[PDB]
Subunit: 196 residues, 2 copies
Amino acid sequence: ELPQMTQQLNSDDMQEQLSATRKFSQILSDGNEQIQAVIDAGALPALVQLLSSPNEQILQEALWALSNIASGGNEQIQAVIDAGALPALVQLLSSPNEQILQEALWALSNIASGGNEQIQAVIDAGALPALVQLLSSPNEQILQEALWALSNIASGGNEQKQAVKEAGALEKLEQLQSHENEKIQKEAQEALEKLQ
Amino acid sequence: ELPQMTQQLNSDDMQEQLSATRKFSQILSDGNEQIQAVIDAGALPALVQLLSSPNEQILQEALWALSNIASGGNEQIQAVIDAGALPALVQLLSSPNEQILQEALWALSNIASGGNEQIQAVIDAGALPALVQLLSSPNEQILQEALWALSNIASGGNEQKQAVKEAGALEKLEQLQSHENEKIQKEAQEALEKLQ
């Protein structure tokens, strides 16, 4: 019904616009409540514990569920932080399965998208060295997220910027210019100037 | 249901752990995809136009829907921003219906919780004055969101914070260290210090 609905919003009859506007709110709040109803069920910590499952499939659906939550609002992020995901995720940064590595990267990018304190919980979980090492990485998939992540962290305060520098970003970042990839080339400039 | 699954997560049987991990993923991804199928059905632009409805009901339902979407990830926020919500939301800042005013404060607050470019979009469409004026409002509910809203903007990069001070925050925020309520004395400190 969604696409009809997006038209009843552009309608002249006020019972039409109202009707459709309510349905849109119902759709939007039902979805948000399914999501909140998972955070509130107490799963996050058990999920976080499954990040170190011996079974790599279990590991991956768990990391997927987490990174999904961590893609939400500043409080879904907090619940993910509060359940102690940051260390586990940072650990997963040094993984052989480049799919697990790349998913953990993306979650950490999202968690570092929020407020300066959350960027700091990330910095405290010791992501920085792990994230600086992945700049050298040969796989451009990763190099790119790795760089996004540090750029997100470059966007925090004086003492986030200082820890990025303090962990070795300046050189690597600097020598990324000479990378064939044009979007990478660019993204480094942006990261450097934030830092200064 | 959610509680039986959260136990399954803590189980020993790996069939159990994984079966539940996928139900959680499935709930999370289904919840995210209803929200998404509303943004991608293009309702945001039309819900934004309904923010100037002369029908109070329509207006509040539209504003309710939008602030839900604005409660999500940096990209929901972007979608809301891209659909031209901010002009309307700032305009709603100068509303007499304190119910609309408070809801529009909460939208702006969520929007201001995203990346530093999103805060700047808030600042640019001129939330700041409207926001600083609400600092004298008698309604302690309103005072708190206006304050939070600014506190989120004060949590941005450096150039963000010079507009907060440049808006008047500093002075008004500073006389807010002697308000009957403790939460407001306290929360002004945070805001004031963030900047300082």
